[PDB]
Amino acid sequence: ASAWPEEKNYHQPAILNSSALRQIAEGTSISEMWQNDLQPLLIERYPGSPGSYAARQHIMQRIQRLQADWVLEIDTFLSQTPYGYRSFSNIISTLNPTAKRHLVLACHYDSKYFSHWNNRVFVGATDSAVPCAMMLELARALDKKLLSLKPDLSLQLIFFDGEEAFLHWSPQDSLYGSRHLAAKMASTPHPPGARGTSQLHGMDLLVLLDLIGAPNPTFPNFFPNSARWFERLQAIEHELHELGLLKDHSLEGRYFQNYSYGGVIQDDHIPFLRRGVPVLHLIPSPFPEVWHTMDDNEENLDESTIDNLNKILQVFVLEYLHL
Amino acid sequence: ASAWPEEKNYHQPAILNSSALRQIAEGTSISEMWQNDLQPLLIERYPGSPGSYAARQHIMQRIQRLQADWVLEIDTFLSQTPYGYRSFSNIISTLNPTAKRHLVLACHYDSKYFSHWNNRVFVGATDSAVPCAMMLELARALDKKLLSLKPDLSLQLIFFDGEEAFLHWSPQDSLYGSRHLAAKMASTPHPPGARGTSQLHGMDLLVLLDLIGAPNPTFPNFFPNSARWFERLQAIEHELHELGLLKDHSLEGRYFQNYSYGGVIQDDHIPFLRRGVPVLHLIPSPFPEVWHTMDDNEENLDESTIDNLNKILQVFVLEYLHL
Amino acid sequence: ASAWPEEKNYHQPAILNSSALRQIAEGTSISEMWQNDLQPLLIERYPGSPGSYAARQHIMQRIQRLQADWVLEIDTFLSQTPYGYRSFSNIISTLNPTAKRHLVLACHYDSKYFSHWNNRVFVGATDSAVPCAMMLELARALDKKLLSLKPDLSLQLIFFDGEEAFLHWSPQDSLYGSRHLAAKMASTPHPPGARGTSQLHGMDLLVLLDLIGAPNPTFPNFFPNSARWFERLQAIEHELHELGLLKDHSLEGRYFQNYSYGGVIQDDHIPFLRRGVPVLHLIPSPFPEVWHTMDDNEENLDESTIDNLNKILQVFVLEYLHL
Amino acid sequence: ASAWPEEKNYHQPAILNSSALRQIAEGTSISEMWQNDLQPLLIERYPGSPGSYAARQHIMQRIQRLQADWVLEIDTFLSQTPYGYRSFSNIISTLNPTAKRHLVLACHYDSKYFSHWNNRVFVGATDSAVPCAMMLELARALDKKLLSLKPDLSLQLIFFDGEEAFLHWSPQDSLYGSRHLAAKMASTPHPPGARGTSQLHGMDLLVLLDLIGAPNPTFPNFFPNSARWFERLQAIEHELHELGLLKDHSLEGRYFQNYSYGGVIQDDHIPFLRRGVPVLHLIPSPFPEVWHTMDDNEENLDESTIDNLNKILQVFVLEYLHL
Amino acid sequence: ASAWPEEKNYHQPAILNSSALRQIAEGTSISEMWQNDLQPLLIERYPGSPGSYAARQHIMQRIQRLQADWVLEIDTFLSQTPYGYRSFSNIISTLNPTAKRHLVLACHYDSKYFSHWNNRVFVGATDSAVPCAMMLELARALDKKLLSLKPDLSLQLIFFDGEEAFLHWSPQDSLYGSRHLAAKMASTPHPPGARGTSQLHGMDLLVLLDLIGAPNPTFPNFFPNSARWFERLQAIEHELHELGLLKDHSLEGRYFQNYSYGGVIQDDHIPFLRRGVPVLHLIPSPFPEVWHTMDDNEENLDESTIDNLNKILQVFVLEYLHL
Numbered sequence A, B, C, D, E: 001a002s003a004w005p006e007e008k009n010y011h012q013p014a015i016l017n018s019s020a021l022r023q024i025a026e027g028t029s030i031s032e033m034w035q036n037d038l039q040p041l042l043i044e045r046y047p048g049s050p051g052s053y054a055a056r057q058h059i060m061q062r063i064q065r066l067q068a069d070w071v072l073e074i075d076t077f078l079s080q081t082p083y084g085y086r087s088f089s090n091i092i093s094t095l096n097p098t099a100k101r102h103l104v105l106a107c108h109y110d111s112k113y114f115s116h117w118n119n120r121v122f123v124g125a126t127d128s129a130v131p132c133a134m135m136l137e138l139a140r141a142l143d144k145k146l147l148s149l150k151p152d153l154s155l156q157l158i159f160f161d162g163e164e165a166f167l168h169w170s171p172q173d174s175l176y177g178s179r180h181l182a183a184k185m186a187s188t189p190h191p192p193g194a195r196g197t198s199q200l201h202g203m204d205l206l207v208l209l210d211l212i213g214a215p216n217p218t219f220p221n222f223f224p225n226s227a228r229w230f231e232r233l234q235a236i237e238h239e240l241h242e243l244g245l246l247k248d249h250s251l252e253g254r255y256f257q258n259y260s261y262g263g264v265i266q267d268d269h270i271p272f273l274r275r276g277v278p279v280l281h282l283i284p285s286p287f288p289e290v291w292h293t294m295d296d297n298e299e300n301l302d303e304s305t306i307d308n309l310n311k312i313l314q315v316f317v318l319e320y321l322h323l
């Protein structure tokens, strides 16, 4: 072995000064997101649907148009399901695919499948369209600072397909895209040429976005080995606050509260967690009230909470990457 | 047929009086223990390592020098790993190894393997040198009373090796020591000649110590089939306090708070829980802030708390045995 | 296929008005239940025993004599245990077995096995003799209304056998009755004739009653996919309070409090949960103080709480069933 | 545990006098079985299909009409498959089901699915329509004698559904009818009321036919626990050959040759074999030139082979049973 | 999915004229293969070793210089072993990779590991150097005719890696490279774009050469799904002898001895077998006397057998592609 698989345990962020926090907050627009990034994602988009494709395309078009040098893979692939073999398509977007080490942001871009019911269709605006767009926006806003990557550490985005069960939740039916990738990754050597290290050794932290966009969200600290990064999220919230750069926000309705969580939620982090990647699992607890109902729509999203999280998330990242 | 494997559900402590308690609190010396028992254990001691043999060795010397008739074993064994085959040696000390029934205290004596960082070394002072020292001090301090063991019950210690993961947490990369010993014990008639009962039948209660020594520990009540025993710790802690025999201690920071914990922590109790041994898992929640950092060192141990838990554990254990 | 299996996902209660609720409250008798439904069952009744058969007869008898066209079946089977192959018998009681959708109420009629000790016997009053009697007392109290059934939806009761471990709680030694019937039903097409849908697609909801009986329960909201229905028991609890209809009750000692839970409890629901049946697990957290003690007897049951739960549950059902 | 489930190991044939053998070989018509029991099933019959339902009904026509008190049970059921849950229906015809012990003859009434090709359809003459017809022709030919069952033994036919793969052969995609029924009978006390003796116990021996009906076939001795029962066929072939009653039959081309076999064949006996039911697996070895060909049709059946095997078999049966 | 996946089942060879056989048999030179392909590969080449690279590199150069448009992929991939992780590389030479249906030839190119014994080194000449060679030679011999592929059917060579155990042969420790490719192929839509047909579905038949190059070898016919292609290897054998294009060859020691085998040989075909690929396993039985000995070397190969085979294969292939 070498020892760069351990740099991640000692990596510390480069915190920002008020002046620079001001720039980031100004730097993101929730209304360009609602419109250019998000509103096209609010379609049925279950696996194999024409929405999976148009969403898939959408996602790319919007990255493909930034200036940073995003390398875009489509891991199309086949997996068995209760209704038989079916075709899935993960989207990986990478800066510096040799960037030996990577911080990874991820969501799922699929939407559960439901029959239409009294003319209503499920689009998951929280589950998980807001996370997709949040990621899209982050690329957009950080684009100029992200150019400065031509520590051997860059950023990677993943939009998994196939997160939701088709019929009914169970290990055998769920997490199609991330069960695949987790494993295809553990058996790809990194960097090219390596001999005992995989692409999983270069995932410093997997930051997973799930179920985001409802009001009054509260995220637990799930794992002890990413706690310190959670504590950063706390602090970034507290300070963006104390400087007036959050909207409709108060410390008694914080998002990241130093309460921990008992059990585990299953999600696209599990395939990775179980292989030892450190996961920062930004899923709120309790779930949104509209969870897995046709009311998980745009009408019930909370614009101001998304905007605040964009700013929190964009800071955490630049801080982690020392940009 | 004998039903002695049930005697454990109806087992009651013989609770102690305020003379007795004063006497115990008197005859335990956090400062001897710190010098004589724990300072030797504070070295890189991952399985393999010279540390490991030193510690193994240390542990046995300080037991061998006490008067009661301890019987130490060194189950050394092979088992597969991500880095190929490797060798582990558990330490089992036992009084009265025909004591049909045994109360068992236990911990792990390895230290996790970490490369060296800024010429710093991971030595695991709470994970888990302190528990090991605590156990060794308890045998010391109780020695003259343990002699009494020449209800057919006695005490037994175990110091597991290979609790930690070599690479990354998983069923397959962890608990090498305890997984091994739980099997070998499930398959060993107890008592010699028995036909249907294994040594696990003889394990009353497994008290397992992990992650002790940091300030403001809070120990959940994890299992309903050991919860009256967790009540006794609550009650011991209380009296030793109302009697003024704890140091820097207040009830607003009790250690045993009647709080119930969601999930399961993974640890050396697992192989014995899933086979039906009761466990009193003295691990705190949340873990210590220094967990699995190079800061899990001696400078960050709280003498006073460790000393308080000695008294508590020592009294628990005498009450269990009726000494 | 047809979409009726999704109906459960949109199904609303037919909430009842004050006068209706006054009627229901007056319609159930806790003492009748106690005398004629529950005292028969407080015997040693573990699988095999004379108890098990006496208990089994007793249940059907008491069902048999009602006016609604209940269809009792037995389902004797055989399963391996750590003492060999022993023989079990589940009780099903169905209304309108052609009712494509059923709401299911279920509990467990076996008693854990213990050696007599001090000439006492484990009879499992809360675990789970009381829940059996409540389901009984609901079939009686609601009989006139339940007759109306000659939305395609009716009610099944299930009394499971062999819930408890024979020696030691493990996946292998536990839930004999429910792992049997989960499977049996997942492989019985429903409605007869169908080609893609099982008897489980026609479980709207499984209400599992376990460990009810003791003073001061608190029931957590275990699952998001049944939370709306937990909320309804919150609403029922409230309104029946606001109206005088509960005894020795205060809202600061509510039964159903919006408190979600950490890790999963294992119980007859699991063979169903993981096949996708939404579950409502009316078990308390913390368990009763008498859990698996000989003291789990008649003397330690709060008749007054059980009465209050009888009423809450009886309403919950009429509201589901639109009676 | 009791005796009778061991009788099947001490069981001996009533070897039959030269004369009666004539009556037997005289009372079976090959062309009645060809027109009346066989040509009906020479149709597409994969499961679910119209052919399936037709065949299942044809089979019953014939059994139902014979004088003996055959007890018919369809066993419909559901199971997961490479195209999703699908439904399956075994057939079981039983005499004296109170008869604790049953000699059991079995085969598979489905056809394997193929697209069409050349406007040609796969029908499974060998695999396994002929096995089926043979069992019918058998129950006819012997009905007058079977009638005598009003040792506690009797006979049972079983036609399995869904033995063949939907897609490709795998333990997950095959033997749907036998994996099922094995389990259903493993879990079924026999005789009614029993507490340790399943319905497999009373399976004396399992004669499974398969791919029968091409010319010049070879049946290896497969299992030691039935080689005694194989030797009798070897003996039965001989003596019927020596006595003139075969047709077109060399002894230097016997059907039952001494010649053990190396590996196993996967077939509807596995499930019943893993659980220790004595099997007699009349499948040829090799397989017919036509196997899983469009040509496995009626033109390439040899009337004489089949007629030869109906004689052997029916004598095998009557000897086993003491008629 | 449609039906082209079934074309194989009905695919027929374009048998050859005795004019052509000569034309072909003339066209292979056992001696150039012997100094141009075979000898380079006779080197230590277990996985990870420089000989592994040296051999891999040799394989391609030769295919590179060929006229056809062979498309060599390189499947470097990482897997777990008893010595820990380690890297591995499979070679995939393909033609018309858009050819939906392929015929596939394979062997493994690694060599078992051994210590050095009295100055001897293991180079599995039999195992399986010759096979790498025989396949290369075929690609030569026929290139001009392969050229004609620009039914949608073509050809593919696969040289696996890590076929040989590292230590003690076992499922977990063998076929590293083929287990990895069956899975990667199982999950890769073929053709590009499809929605339920994998790359395995294009494998019409996998021809697997192993342990070839001793004298007088008997290849059994292992599988019924491919016996009709074993018979073609007879027909071709037997006709080339009587035409005299075989050397040192009697028809009293034919290789393809229509003789059936019992059990299954574990080898690289297995992962492909249990996913339903049709396999023609050309591994003699018994294995060479040299097997897994220092003596499995050039000295003990039989130039004449090898050339012979070299001729049957090439014919078989030409007959499969109709060329």
Ligand SMILES: O=C1Nc2cccc(O)c2/C1=C/c1ccc2[nH]cnc2c1
Binding pocket: A127, A164, A165, A169, A210, A211, A265, A266, A267, C223, C224, C225
């Ligand atoms: O999909 C699901 N079906 C369920 C049925 C019963 C209980 C459950 O917890 C679930 C469930 C969980 C879940 C977890 C993360 C998710 N992210 C987006 N949708 C998400 C869903």
Ligand SMILES: O=C1Nc2cccc(O)c2/C1=C/c1ccc2[nH]cnc2c1
Binding pocket: A223, A224, A225, B127, B164, B165, B169, B210, B211, B265, B266, B267
């Ligand atoms: O070793 C570990 N690596 C992890 C990565 C993510 C989450 C985790 O809980 C762990 C973990 C757990 C753990 C549990 C009990 C222990 N006792 C002593 N060390 C202990 C460690």
Ligand SMILES: O=C1Nc2cccc(O)c2/C1=C/c1ccc2[nH]cnc2c1
Binding pocket: B223, B224, B225, C127, C164, C165, C169, C210, C211, C265, C266, C267
């Ligand atoms: O049976 C059990 N033996 C245990 C030993 C240690 C820890 C445990 O949680 C259990 C346990 C659980 C349990 C769960 C649900 C039940 N419902 C009725 N009895 C119940 C018992």
Ligand SMILES: O=C1Nc2cccc(O)c2/C1=C/c1ccc2[nH]cnc2c1
Binding pocket: D127, D164, D165, D169, D210, D211, D265, D266, D267, E223, E224, E225
């Ligand atoms: O169905 C099958 N598809 C295969 C593909 C490759 C190799 C094989 O051995 C098989 C196979 C076996 C088989 C076994 C018993 C049968 N009884 C009736 N049809 C039968 C078929």
Ligand SMILES: O=C1Nc2cccc(O)c2/C1=C/c1ccc2[nH]cnc2c1
Binding pocket: E127, E164, E165, E169, E210, E211, E265, E266, E267
């Ligand atoms: O590797 C092996 N070790 C064994 C030990 C005992 C019995 C066996 O059949 C084997 C064995 C089989 C085998 C199969 C294909 C091979 N190709 C090259 N080596 C090959 C070896």
Ligand SMILES: [Zn+2]
Binding pocket: B112, B127, B164, B292
């Ligand atoms: Zn640790």
Ligand SMILES: [Zn+2]
Binding pocket: C112, C127, C164, C292
């Ligand atoms: Zn219980």
Ligand SMILES: [Zn+2]
Binding pocket: E112, E124, E127, E164, E292
């Ligand atoms: Zn070999």
